[PDB]
Amino acid sequence: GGYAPDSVQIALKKMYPTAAGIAWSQDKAYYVADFVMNGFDTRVWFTPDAEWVMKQTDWETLDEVPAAVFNAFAASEFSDGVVQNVTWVQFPEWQPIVAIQVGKPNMQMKYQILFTPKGEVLRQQNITNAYNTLGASTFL
Numbered sequence: 001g002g003y004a005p006d007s008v009q010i011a012l013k014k015m016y017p018t019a020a021g022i023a024w025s026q027d028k029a030y031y032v033a034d035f036v037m038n039g040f041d042t043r044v045w046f047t048p049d050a051e052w053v054m055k056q057t058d059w060e061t062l063d064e065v066p067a068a069v070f071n072a073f074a075a076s077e078f079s080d081g082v083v084q085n086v087t088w089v090q091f092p093e094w095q096p097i098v099a100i101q102v103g104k105p106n107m108q109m110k111y112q113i114l115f116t117p118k119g120e121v122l123r124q125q126n127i128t129n130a131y132n133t134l135g136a137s138t139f140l
Contacts, residue, residue, distance in 0.1 A: 004031045011050040028136045055090040069098045072119030078102045099134055
């Protein structure tokens, strides 16, 4: 479902031959493939020239993250919060990123923290009432 040029669809098939029920959408000048891979929600961004520029895997839980990220999150001011999502963000040339979305229900605030695999904080964003916080505008 959704539109994507044939070249872009062929490029995704080459990367994930077992991918089924793919939903295509646009995010700025990118085509985004949305599907389930190994039980995880997966999204792949493509240029119109069928070059992949970003991958996202919704791990959802902290038991999937590198131990350095787990320990940095556990020592942070968000450790007591409700984890809403955990995403492994990858790129063709750049280092991967762990994006954690955590709610503070008593504070009535939602936050997004971007970590390097070594546990270094790249960004602490207040995403209360914000949408598409993991799209091309955050990473590309």
